[PDB]
Amino acid sequence: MPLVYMNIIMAFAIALAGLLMYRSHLMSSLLCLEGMMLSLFIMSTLIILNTHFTLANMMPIILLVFAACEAALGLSLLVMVSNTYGTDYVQNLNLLQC
Amino acid sequence: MNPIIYTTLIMTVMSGTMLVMISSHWLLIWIGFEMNLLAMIPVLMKNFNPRATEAATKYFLTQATASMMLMMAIIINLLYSGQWTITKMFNPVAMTMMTMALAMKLGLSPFHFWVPEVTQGISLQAGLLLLTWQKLAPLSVLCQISQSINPNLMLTMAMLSILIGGWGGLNQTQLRKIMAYSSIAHMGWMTAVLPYNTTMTILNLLIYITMTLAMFMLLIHSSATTTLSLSHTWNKMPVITSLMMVTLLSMGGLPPLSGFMPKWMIIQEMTKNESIIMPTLMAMTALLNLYFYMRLAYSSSLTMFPSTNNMKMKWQFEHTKQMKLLPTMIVLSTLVLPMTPALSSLN
Amino acid sequence: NVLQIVRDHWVHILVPVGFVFGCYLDRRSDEKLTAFRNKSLLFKRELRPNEEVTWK
Amino acid sequence: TMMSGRPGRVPLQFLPNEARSLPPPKLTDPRLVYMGFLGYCSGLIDNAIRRRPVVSAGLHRQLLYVTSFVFFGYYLLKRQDYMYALRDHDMFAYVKSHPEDFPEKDKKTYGEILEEFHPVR
Amino acid sequence: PPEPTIRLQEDPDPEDENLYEKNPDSHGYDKDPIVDLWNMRVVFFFGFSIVLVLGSTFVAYLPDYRMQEWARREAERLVKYREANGLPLMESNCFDPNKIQLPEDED
Amino acid sequence: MLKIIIPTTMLLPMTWMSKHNMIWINATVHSLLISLISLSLLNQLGENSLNFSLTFFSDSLSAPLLVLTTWLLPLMLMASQSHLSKETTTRKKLYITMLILLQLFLIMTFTATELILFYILFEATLVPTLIIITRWGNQTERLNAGLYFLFYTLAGSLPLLVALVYIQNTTGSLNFLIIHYWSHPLSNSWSNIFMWLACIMAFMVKMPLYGLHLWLPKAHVEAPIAGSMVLAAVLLKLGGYGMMRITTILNPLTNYMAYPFLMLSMWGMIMTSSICLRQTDLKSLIAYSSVSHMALVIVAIMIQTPWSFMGATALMIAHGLTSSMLFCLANTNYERVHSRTMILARGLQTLLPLMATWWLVASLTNLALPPSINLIGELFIITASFSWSNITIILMGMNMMITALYSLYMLITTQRGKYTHHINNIKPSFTRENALMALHILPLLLLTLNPKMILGPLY
Amino acid sequence: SSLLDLIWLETILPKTTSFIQMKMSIMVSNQKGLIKLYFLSFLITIMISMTLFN
Amino acid sequence: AKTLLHKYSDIPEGTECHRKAYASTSIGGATGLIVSAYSIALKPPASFLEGVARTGRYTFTSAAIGAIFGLTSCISAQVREKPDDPLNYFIGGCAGGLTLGARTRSYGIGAAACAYMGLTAALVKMGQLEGWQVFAEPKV
Amino acid sequence: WIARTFYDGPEKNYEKTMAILQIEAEKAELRLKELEVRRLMRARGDGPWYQYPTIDKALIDHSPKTTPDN
Amino acid sequence: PFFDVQKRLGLDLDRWMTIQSAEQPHKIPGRCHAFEKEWIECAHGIGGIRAEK
């Protein structure tokens, strides 16, 4: 396992950790999710190209498409949340408590 | 929304689950999960209010993170073995990340935090769908890759789920949070037998789904979401309160009720594998679920709470919409213990 | 008056019907445990000229 | 015993053809009677919920419930018996094909076995 | 403080009702005299007449399935035989030693 | 065995299809007929057992308990007929349904060829009792009493299920006959020690043991009269039956293991008999007397000698009948006084002479006066304990004395002296109550003529 | 009657269990609903699982 | 991970008291740090300095508990000349429990700690002796 | 009269108990054998039970692949 | 769980993309075609457990 794959997985772990920190700005949560899918795309593309799995060249595009669709949904949700409060701050969603 | 749109979204949710269940390719499983996630969001927001929007966005965030972890596990598995078929996981912690993603999808501890919030935010029908249908696909994947799981991690998260559900149900006055913690504890019971017997997992899933359907339909019929709001049901529909109390006793695992069948079997199975301490601890912890079920039963039908004057008008009207499957659900969740050996049908 | 007291006193017949049904079911369940009939070491016996089974 | 991977198994076959060599459950089977009783209880609860005379509101509805319950119970019992027959057949075949793992124990009489005696005092 | 000092609209606690006042010979069974008398009669007949008498007689004359007289006759015949033979009554060993195979110690 | 079970099941449709004012009459008559049917089981053999089928068998330990369980239902119906007068037909039918279900569960529990079936029914008996206690209860603490009764039982019994499934996994069968013939010694090991504890504590909690007896005063005081009757008469004997059934597998580990329990019971009988002396409540006093008697039964079972087992069986039957009678008497007083405290209503012998005679007979039979079966069990257990150790008698001696004391104390506080001047609603005793006491007391004095009928399988 | 039966025997089994379960329920269920804390806990448990179970 | 378990279990019970005490102290410190991280993540009390003080308090309490456990159990096992006896673990376990009670300064919590830690230590010793499995592998 | 009309002989109960014991002993030994067979099959993988799916070899393409060395 | 509809109906919904050595377009071989071919042939029908050992 070369160092490039390790760097990509480290990048994904950093994006996931930053998503889990939640300083503020749920928009940053969506940004972290998109960084995660970008790292997934890059490493999956590198693995597939390297092993010459010709039919697997389908998979990255599919992934991209689906992930981007998810982003759209998320953005819509964000707007409505903002549409209630005027700002996308995380701490505004304190109505529901365990 | 438009009934045609609602029907299309429900069919899309079910088609995503079926695509997960019938496919042998990891990418198709991920696509089915994506389809289910996409079609589930409007269902949680049928009744538009800030609470439902907050619940939907929390659910979307958790499920999207779970899907990303699932894809990373799939890609690492492909890296260490050029395989896409759903089989033995072929690798170290790639399996750990797969288990974490499936646990977040199911709501197992320590990823349980979103279930009570999403259940409280959404209505009762959305909560019914969320707590019943959304468990089939991740449990199917876990049953498929059960021989790969590390028993230590799975058993740890199962015991954590049971403990957290038992403790968190004690503090609730809202009925939806009670149902959410019950779901967490039941999933904990389900996943503790996956390393040993997947048939027992499926049996527990069937029994739990029947009991949850009966409970949610009874809660919808007597439209109460709070303990005190439920305490007013006896003055109109005492038979509903009696059926609800019997169902709650069944969900507590009391013999000879139906809810005793899974735990019993599970305990039995775990004793075949030279495991005693965990079954003992699981029973002693499910005692807490029984305690808060019994408190709800006290507040529901065993005592008569004060009523209000306007209640008299409700005496003059009858429910226009009637649920056809409610009678069957109650009987199946109450009186199917003698048919226990039928579990050999590999349900 | 017949056909009138029946509609009110019909319930009484149920317990005795259950009793006779239980007796019949007990005999029927007994019929399935005859694998060792007239085969015990303590009671091996030669059948009578007009006997088929030692016990029913 | 995970029989999902059994060789020569049709994926979505509820009852395989080889199950037809097993005796079907009798129509007076106690489990079938219990399923009919479950259907009758379902009918009674259905009458009670909709605020109808519990015993004598719908005879057709109760009959339909009982009949459907009996039908499903008969097929479920067939599948149950078939699966248990498969389990026993597999166990016996494995015991037959692996003699070294299941040795014949030497028959020993109690007169030549020494069991420790613990008095009750 | 304009509060009515009443927590809620409640029925007053009813006083206990006597079955003797509205009906002498009330038997303490029911407020309806006919059901009263018939309940008394059926309880007395099916408890004292049927169960306590016929059941006690049935239990008294139960056949000897415990085999007490059988055991007494067996012991009588056995002792009659043993005394005559000169055998020493009951043996110490419950089973014959010749058919018991002890394990040899060789210690 | 179905000749008893099927009529008990048919009791339910008969009750629910009964005319609105004929439920009590129909229920009592058919319950008495079913009791008569149950009498056939008493003719036991000196051989193995009455093995009816693969699912149910009878034994001369099971037969007296079955007969008592069947006989208790008409008495419970007659006792409950009074305070359920102002109640709707549906709820009275539900009450009768719960009583019938309790009888059915007990009947299936006492035959129970298999231990898992026994456990399932043993815990199935819990639901009707809990509902009866928490629904038709007068005070506000019935909910807490129901919670205590449920959770003590389940905490005791949850390890029992694990122990049973483990035992079946190792041995291969949970059947009583197979277990008895294939019993093998248990090595003195930590795992075996914990298996013994799991097998024993579930039945110990229901006796109940002196350490674990708290739920019982709450449950007895807060339950209605039928609930108190069924708790004191039958439900306490389930633990003793379970111990006598399960102890066979336990040896030789029981000797070392038994000491903590033997000491707890021998001191707890004294403690509870002494507690009875200073009590302000009839129901609590009867409950503590029951605790003392069942502690003695625990001692008898733990000694595990033939005389111990015969004494335990006789004492269980006698205590069931006597405690049911005592609770019935206390309820007759309560229905007139509505206070349920001894010191309020006094001198009742002057106003109710026949009821005072019933009180005297009940207190005498609780006192273990010879040749009643109460003293038969008392003396058999005492002799077995003396053979076990010559010092036990001293404790036993104290117990007997203390018992007599509080018994006559309960007879003197409420019946003798001067009647309270203010109470004027003490009406003459009804025929129903006198019939209830007569039907409670006559079986004891009939059984003392034929003690072997209740002395168990080791007779 | 009072020292052992009404107080200490009550203190040991039932009251201790009630107090412990009450405290555990209060601790577990007292979450303010901030997904910040939830996901920080998620990160902590993910890293702990990566460090402990392999 | 299991490195601390291997370090603790490899040392004989009746010898090397200091090594056992050090291993127990390390295990206790790790447990206290994990609990502190959980508490900080779930509840930010007021600030960084209060949080680090809380983590230090929890870690030192757990480390002291473990150290007392190890030293007392090992010393009791060595002096009694009867190793593989759960009673030694009982005594050491609630010496640790009593130290916890002294740290929290409550007699009731000290007695509760003695009960519920001596019993737990005895149970762990019995499990080690008899081979009980907390997380059994799937045998069949 | 009671023995004639209500009860039966000892042979009936004796032989019924013999049959019941025989059936129960067979069930117990079958349970032990089934547990042992399950344990053996799971570890070895030789038996019909516990079969986990592998890649089907009918999916492999056996054709020249534009390169002589596959 | 897994409902093997493809095998029951003979549809081949996604089995074409599972392995490297399964009918690539224009007969383009994977980098490890021979090794995967050998491993698949060896493990066919053996089962996962015996296959793994």
Ligand SMILES: CCCCCCCCCCCCCCCCCC(=O)OC[C@H](COP(=O)([O-])OCC(O)COP(=O)([O-])OC[C@@H](COC(=O)CCCCCCCCCCCCCCCCC)OC(=O)CCCCCCCCCCCCCCCCC)OC(=O)CCCCCCCCCCCCCCCCC
């Ligand atoms: C062990 C196995 C063997 C036994 C099986 C046990 C189970 C069997 C039954 C299962 C369920 C089926 C029936 C239940 C439906 C409910 C309907 C109802 O309430 O009854 C009203 C109805 C009469 O009322 P109605 O005039 O129609 O109208 C009044 C309204 O209905 C209602 O009036 P209302 O609303 O004004 O009254 C209010 C009341 C009314 O509320 C209720 O009564 C609710 C009903 C109970 C809940 C059922 C839950 C589901 C079943 C669970 C069973 C649990 C068993 C396990 C053990 C645990 C015990 C809990 O509710 C309350 O008072 C609130 C508080 C209640 C107290 C606490 C609640 C505890 C209830 C638990 C009961 C468990 C046993 C039930 C037995 C049957 C009871 C009917 O009763 C009946 O007539 C039907 C009874 C059965 C019919 C028998 C017919 C057969 C006879 C002819 C054939 C011969 C057979 C042999 C053939 C050969 C012979 C020749």
Ligand SMILES: CCCCCCCCCCCCCCCCC[C@@H](O)O[C@H](CO[C@H](O)CCCCCCCCCCCCCCC)COP(=O)(O)OCC[N+](C)(C)C
């Ligand atoms: C809670 C009570 C249970 C009730 C459940 C709902 C009842 C209504 C269902 C109506 C009929 C459903 C049957 C479906 C028709 C054909 C099914 C067939 O094609 O599928 C087969 C399988 O048949 C079904 O699985 C059997 C379902 C029957 C469930 C009954 C068991 C209930 C548990 C015992 C409680 C008693 C309940 C009795 C009252 C209903 C092939 O499965 P296979 O592709 O090879 O492998 C997948 C399953 N594996 C992975 C576990 C091995």
Ligand SMILES: CCCCCCCCCCCCCCCCC[C@@H](O)O[C@H](CO[C@H](O)CCCCCCCCCCCCCCC)COP(=O)(O)OCC[N+](C)(C)C
């Ligand atoms: C009111 C004042 C008195 C007036 C009346 C005066 C007359 C007094 C006479 C009454 C008793 C005095 C003693 C006389 C005894 C003579 C009868 C006795 O000998 O018979 C007994 C018979 O009694 C029965 O054995 C005991 C009664 C059975 C008890 C069963 C209870 C009834 C069922 C009700 C429900 C059960 C509830 C409790 C559950 C366990 C003992 O018989 P036994 O010596 O052996 O052998 C009989 C002959 N054999 C050999 C041919 C068989």
Ligand SMILES: CCCCCCCCCCCCCCCCC[C@@H](O)O[C@H](CO[C@H](O)CCCCCCCCCCCCCCC)COP(=O)(O)OCC[N+](C)(C)C
């Ligand atoms: C609260 C109301 C009453 C509830 C019920 C109470 C009854 C249950 C109590 C259980 C009785 C004792 C349990 C174990 C007894 C074993 C014998 C032991 O005491 O003697 C010595 C044992 O020495 C010490 O006792 C070692 C154990 C010390 C740890 C136990 C904790 C002591 C007090 C705890 C009491 C708390 C009980 C309730 C918990 C919730 C013998 O030395 P040794 O030869 O080596 O061991 C022999 C056993 N072998 C053969 C299996 C090895």
Ligand SMILES: CCCCCCCCCCCCCCCCC[C@@H](O)O[C@H](CO[C@H](O)CCCCCCCCCCCCCCC)COP(=O)(O)OCC[N+](C)(C)C
């Ligand atoms: C002078 C007489 C003194 C003694 C009186 C004894 C009275 C005995 C009453 C108690 C009987 C208990 C019931 C016994 C049931 C078990 C036996 C049962 O099987 O008998 C059945 C018959 O049982 C009877 O029908 C029970 C009668 C119950 C009624 C008793 C009298 C009271 C009835 C009251 C009814 C209502 C009265 C009027 C109300 C207005 C037929 O059995 P069967 O399968 O062939 O057995 C064959 C055995 N063989 C092979 C050896 C031949």
Ligand SMILES: CCCCCCCC/C=C/CCCCCCCC(=O)OC[C@H](COP(=O)(O)OCCN)OC(=O)CCCCCCC/C=C/CCCCCCCC
């Ligand atoms: C008050 C009741 C008395 C309580 C006395 C002790 C209390 C302290 C114990 C607390 C719970 C401890 C849980 C863990 C105990 C572990 C015991 C154990 O595992 O033994 C199982 C033993 C052997 O294990 P294997 O590994 O399979 O054997 C192979 C190698 N020989 O097998 C068995 O016997 C299984 C039986 C289950 C054991 C029961 C566990 C619970 C404790 C026993 C019951 C006592 C408490 C009852 C509560 C009373 C409330 C009314």
